[PDB]
């Protein structure tokens, strides 16, 4: 019917951080996953629950695309059943996730001389998130038990901390753009049949 | 919540916030080094004082959590590291004048001008000439003149400062709950809280001396040989039984005996191995040297070099429009940024210096997965040890035949073997008595068993019982020769060299035992043996995470520095020295004098 815009998600002009990650709905279109599969422009392309080759011959009820920017080491934490700061307090994939995770290097785009501090991430929290939840809160996190009344000090820190992306950093400390495609299939009418 | 978790949260935030400031200060200082200009000095010291202020505030905030409640030892190590007060302990005026003393002593040592009496219109520094005179002269009286003039002048100019420098540093030590500044220096080897591996700060002494005895039988005989041949060069001043004078040994101080390979060669009519001509014949360059360097390490089973290493580093002097300082250095800038700075030339010596530096870089790559504060060697000797045992393997005839530099028809015999062992001995075994004596004297001046009125006396009264070098000009207490050396004048530790030598030969013995090598040990090469590579990596990745006693027991099978590998490495030399001195006088007596 209509070829749907993978171009607005993959070749976007701007991406968002990992604490406030962008989620966009894909509905009533025909998708071409073969373009994405052997594009050989993606560092990692890993699909859980569906085999990567048989994706086109399958129909889905609702498909979601989430986008953010992470570090090079942290891409392994974007997977079902892993721990770390990103997997605990930033982006939690369930233990039954049906979908794909894509990440590719963006040092050409996302890094600058003098550094680029505009991609942020949350480091502390009071609990671990359950799957597919977003926390945008910017409240001050106390570590101990003494109050600090909305102002930082001892044992009270800001929860958000900023990335620093320089052109000269190593592979592990370089920016990676991540798109997570989440599929859900149930007994409703269809929306995305390639 | 227990202070257990509060401290860990503090440390986590600290690591994530400190990595970045480290990286910026690092890149600033790098760009200054590879391009000298006042603007870059401005950028450098700005970023630096930012980083220093950061660490000061972090420590003054970290002092709060008391470490009698923490049981996890990594947390205790990190908090102890971060808790150290530093020179911020003492009062404002004391810190002011102490920093001023340090800076002025360094400056005055670096700006020494000595002037000869025959040409008062031409006066010369230390580092270009003075060093050249005393290294490559064959004249007695002129060398004694240069030596006496330099030592007398700068020693009398420096001693009044160092004198109470002593007590200021001692109180700075004492405040932080120590007996003497020597204890603060020795604390780098301290380990407690792990049963079976504790190491008191005093134990080191009781070790370093207990080793030195075993090292004297080999040393004594060498000191005979070096003396006997020297009798032929200056046959009007030296004694058949006495000690060597000071102005006959090469460098200004005698820190090494490498400058005497000309007058003390075993078999002179035989040339050594030097592949400079073989390199310029095949038109090598910097890229080829460093490629072979990384190839050696890939053979042993270690990582390759980062792409940023090839892109951003400077492996050639960049010409005359751009200046630089090209002391060979291996840079860890953080965030996975590893580089090398070197003004390379196509020579044999740089072929080994490249291996030394890449060994440094490999250590830094190995411990990069540890917390920020635990990113160093186990103690202050391990970096240099791991750097040296690589040149030691790459400098054999076997590896050089493998690389294709020497034609495979180069046959070696017992004369060239003894040549290599002697050239190694001069620079390795000859630096140990000097090192041990120097730091023993510093420890005794700091602990106070050498009253002021006797200081210089016991200095020489040590040189005659340990090193066996007598002073050509008599000195009273108005002289101060130990303050002349760069390391002592500018507050650096000095036992790192002794422990480095010992750990170095222990590592070599262990590795090229597990690497399936039989024969004399100075022929062993670890090229193409992944078994030894993993045994080394299981020590490299730890960093300061766990006591150095275990870090060493992993690789050598022992918990303390031992000399049997070193004495084993020099046994082919010991056997020949015993027969060469079968007739000559071995040892020395203090009953001789040069004046």
UniProtKB/Swiss-Prot annotation, chain A:
Query: Residues annotated as region Integrin-binding motif?
Result: 71-73
Q: What is the effect of changing residue 39 to L?
A: In strain: Omicron/BA.1
Question: Mutating residue 145 to N: effect?
Answer: In strain: 20A.EU2, Iota/B.1.526, Omicron/BA.1, Omicron/BA.2, Omicron/BA.2.12.1, Omicron/BA.2.75, Omicron/BA.4, Omicron/BA.5, Omicron/BQ.1.1, Omicron/XBB.1.5, Omicron/EG.5.1
Q: Where is this region: Receptor-binding domain (RBD)?
A: 1-194
Map out region (Receptor-binding motif) in residue numbers: 105-176
Renumbered residue ranges of the record's region Immunodominant HLA epitope recognized by the CD8+: 116-124
Name the reported effect of residue 152 to D.
Answer: Increased replication in human TMEM106B overexpressing cells
Mutagenesis / variant outcome for changing residue 169 to T: Reduced host ACE2-binding affinity in vitro
Annotated region described as Disordered, given as residue ranges: 123-158
Swapping residue 169 to T leads to an effect described as: In strain: 19B/501T
Impact when changing residue 7 to H = In strain: Omicron/BA.2.75, Omicron/XBB.1.5, Omicron/EG.5.1
Function of the molecule: Attaches the virion to the cell membrane by interacting with host receptor, initiating the infection. The major receptor is host ACE2. When S2/S2' has been cleaved, binding to the receptor triggers direct fusion at the cell membrane. When S2/S2' has not been cleaved, binding to the receptor results in internalization of the virus by endocytosis using host TFRC and GRM2 and leading to fusion of the virion membrane with the host endosomal membrane. Alternatively, may use NRP1/NRP2 and integrin as entry receptors.
Q: What name appears for this protein in its UniProt entry?
A: Spike protein S1
Q: What is the lineage of its organism?
A: Viruses, Riboviria, Orthornavirae, Pisuviricota, Pisoniviricetes
Section of the entire sequence shown: 333 to 526 of 1273
UniProtKB/Swiss-Prot annotation, chain B:
Enumerate the residue ranges of region (Interaction with SARS-CoV spike glycoprotein): 12-23, 64-66, 335-339
On induction, the UniProt comment says: Up-regulated in failing heart. Expression is induced by IFNA and IFNG. Exposure to cigarette smoke increases expression in lungs. Expression is decreased in nasal and bronchial epithelium of individuals with allergy after allergen challenge. IL13 stimulation decreases expression in nasal and bronchial epithelium.
Localization per record: Cell membrane; Cytoplasm; Cell projection, Cilium; Apical cell membrane
Report the domain of life of the source organism: Eukaryota
Give the residues the record marks as binding chloride: 151, 459, 463
Please give the annotated consequence of changing residue 375 to A. Slightly inhibits interaction with SARS-CoV spike glycoprotein
Gene Ontology CC annotation, any one:
endoplasmic reticulum lumen
Annotated positions binding Zn(2+): 356, 360, 384
Q: Does Signal appear among the keywords?
A: yes
What does the record give as the reaction this protein catalyses? angiotensin II + H2O = angiotensin-(1-7) + L-phenylalanine; angiotensin I + H2O = angiotensin-(1-9) + L-leucine; bradykinin(1-8) + H2O = bradykinin(1-7) + L-phenylalanine; neurotensin + H2O = neurotensin-(1-12) + L-leucine
**Per UniProt, what does mutating residue 57 to K do?**
Increases slightly the interaction with RBD domain of SARS-CoV-2 spike protein
What, per the annotation, is the impact of changing residue 255 to Q?
Complete loss of enzyme activity. Does not affect amino acid transport activity of SLC6A19
Give the chief site where it resides.
membrane
Outcome of mutating residue 9 to Y: Increases slightly the interaction with RBD domain of SARS-CoV-2 spike protein. In sACE2.v2.2; increases interaction with RBD domain of SARS-CoV-2 spike protein
GO BP, sorted A to Z: angiotensin maturation; angiotensin-mediated drinking behavior; blood vessel diameter maintenance; entry receptor-mediated virion attachment to host cell; maternal process involved in female pregnancy; membrane fusion; negative regulation of ERK1 and ERK2 cascade; negative regulation of smooth muscle cell proliferation
Glycosylated position list = 35, 72, 85, 304, 414, 528
Q: How is its activity regulated?
A: Regulated by chloride and fluoride, but not bromide. Chloride increases angiotensin I and decreases angiotensin II cleavage. Inhibited by MLN-4760, cFP_Leu, and EDTA, but not by the ACE inhibitors lisinopril, captopril and enalaprilat. Highly potent and selective in vitro ACE2 inhibitors were identified.
Found in which tissues? Expressed in endothelial cells from small and large arteries, and in arterial smooth muscle cells (at protein level). Expressed in enterocytes of the small intestine, Leydig cells and Sertoli cells (at protein level). Expressed in the renal proximal tubule and the small intestine (at protein level). Expressed in heart, kidney, testis, and gastrointestinal system (at protein level). In lung, expressed at low levels in some alveolar type 2 cells, the expression seems to be individual-specific (at protein level). Expressed in nasal epithelial cells (at protein level).
Give the pH dependence of activity as annotated: Optimum pH is 6.5 in the presence of 1 M NaCl. Active from pH 6 to 9.
Which protein, by its recorded name, is this? Angiotensin-converting enzyme 2
Gene source species: Homo sapiens (Human)
Please state the gene responsible for encoding this protein.
ACE2
């Amino acid at each position: 019917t209509n070829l749907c815009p993978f171009g607005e998600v993959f070749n976007a002009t701007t991406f968002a951080s990992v604490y406030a990650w962008n989620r966009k709905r894909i509905s009533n279109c025909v998708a071409d996953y073969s373009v994405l599969y052997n594009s050989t422009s993606f560092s990692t392309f890993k699909c859980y629950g569906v085999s990567p080759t048989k994706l086109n011959d399958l129909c889905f009820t609702n498909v979601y695309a989430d986008s953010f920017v992470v570090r090079g080491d942290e891409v392994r934490q974007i997977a079902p059943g892993q721990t770390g700061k990103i997997a605990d307090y930033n982006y939690k994939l369930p233990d039954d996730f049906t979908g794909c995770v894509i990440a590719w290097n963006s040092n050409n785009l996302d890094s600058k001389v003098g550094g680029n501090y505009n991609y942020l991430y949350r480091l502390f929290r009071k609990s671990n998130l359950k799957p597919f939840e977003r926390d945008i809160s910017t409240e001050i996190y106390q570590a101990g038990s003494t109050p600090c009344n909305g102002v930082e000090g001892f044992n009270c820190y800001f929860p958000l901390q900023s990335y620093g992306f320089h052109p000269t950093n190593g592979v592990g400390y370089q920016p990676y753009r991540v798109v997570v495609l989440s599929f859900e299939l149930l007994n409703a009418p269809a929306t995305v049949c390639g | 919540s227990t202070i257990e978790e509060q401290a860990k949260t503090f440390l986590d935030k600290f690591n994530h916030e400190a990595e970045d400031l480290f990286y910026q200060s690092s890149l600033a200082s790098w760009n200054y080094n590879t391009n000298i200009t006042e603007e870059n000095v401005q950028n450098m010291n700005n970023a630096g004082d930012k980083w220093s202020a950061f660490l000061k505030e972090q420590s003054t905030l970290a002092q709060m959590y008391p470490l009698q409640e923490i049981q996890n030892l990594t947390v205790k190590l990190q908090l102890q590291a971060l808790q150290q007060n530093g020179s911020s302990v003492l009062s404002e005026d004391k810190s002011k004048r102490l920093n001023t003393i340090l800076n002025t002593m360094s400056t005055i040592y670096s700006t020494g001008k000595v002037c000869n009496p025959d040409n008062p219109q031409e006066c010369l520094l230390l580092e270009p000439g003075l060093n050249e005179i005393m290294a490559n002269s064959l004249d007695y009286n002129e060398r004694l003149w240069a030596w006496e003039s330099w030592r007398s002048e700068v020693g009398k100019q420096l001693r009044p400062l160092y004198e109470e420098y002593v007590v200021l540093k001692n109180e700075m030590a004492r405040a932080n709950h120590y007996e003497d500044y020597g204890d603060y220096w020795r604390g780098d080897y301290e380990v407690n809280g792990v049963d079976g591996y504790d190491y008191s700060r005093g134990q080191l002494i009781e070790d370093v001396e207990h080793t030195f005895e075993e090292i004297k039988p080999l040393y004594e005989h060498l000191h005979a040989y070096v003396r006997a041949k020297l009798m032929n060069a200056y046959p009007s001043y030296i004694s058949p039984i006495g000690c060597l004078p000071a102005h006959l040994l090469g460098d200004m101080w005698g820190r090494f005996w490498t400058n005497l390979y000309s007058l003390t060669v075993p078999f002179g009519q035989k040339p050594n191995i030097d592949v400079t001509d073989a390199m310029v014949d095949q038109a090598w360059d910097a890229q080829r040297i460093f490629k072979e360097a990384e190839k050696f390490f890939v053979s042993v089973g270690l990582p390759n070099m980062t792409q940023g290493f090839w892109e951003n580093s400077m492996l050639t002097d960049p010409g005359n429009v751009q200046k630089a300082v090209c002391h060979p250095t291996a840079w860890d800038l953080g965030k996975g940024d590893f580089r090398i700075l070197m003004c390379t030339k196509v020579t044999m010596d740089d072929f080994l210096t490249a291996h030394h530096e890449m060994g440094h870089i490999q250590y830094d790559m190995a411990y990069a997965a540890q917390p920020f504060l635990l990113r160093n060697g186990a103690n202050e000797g391990f970096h240099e040890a791991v750097g040296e045992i690589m040149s030691l393997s790459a400098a054999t005839p076997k590896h050089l035949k493998s690389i294709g530099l020497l034609s495979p028809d180069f046959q070696e015999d017992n004369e060239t073997e003894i040549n290599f062992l002697l050239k190694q001995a001069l620079t390795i075994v000859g630096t140990l008595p000097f090192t041990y004596m120097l730091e023993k004297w510093r420890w005794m001046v700091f602990k106070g068993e050498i009253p002021k009125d006797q200081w210089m006396k016991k200095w020489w009264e040590m040189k005659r019982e340990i090193v066996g070098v007598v002073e050509p000009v008599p000195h009273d207490e108005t002289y101060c020769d130990p303050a002349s050396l760069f390391h002592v004048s500018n507050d650096y530790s000095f036992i790192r060299y002794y422990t480095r030598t010992l750990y170095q030969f222990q590592f070599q013995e262990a590795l090229c035992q597990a690497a399936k090598h039989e024969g004399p040990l100075h022929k062993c090469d670890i090229s193409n043996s992944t078994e030894a590579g993993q045994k080394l990596f299981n020590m490299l990745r730890l960093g300061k995470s766990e006591p150095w006693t275990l870090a060493l027991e992993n690789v050598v099978g022992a918990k303390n520095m031992n000399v049997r590998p070193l004495l084993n490495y020099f046994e082919p030399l010991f056997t020949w020295l015993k027969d060469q001195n079968k007739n000559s006088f071995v040892g020395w007596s203090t009953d001789w004098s040069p004046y």
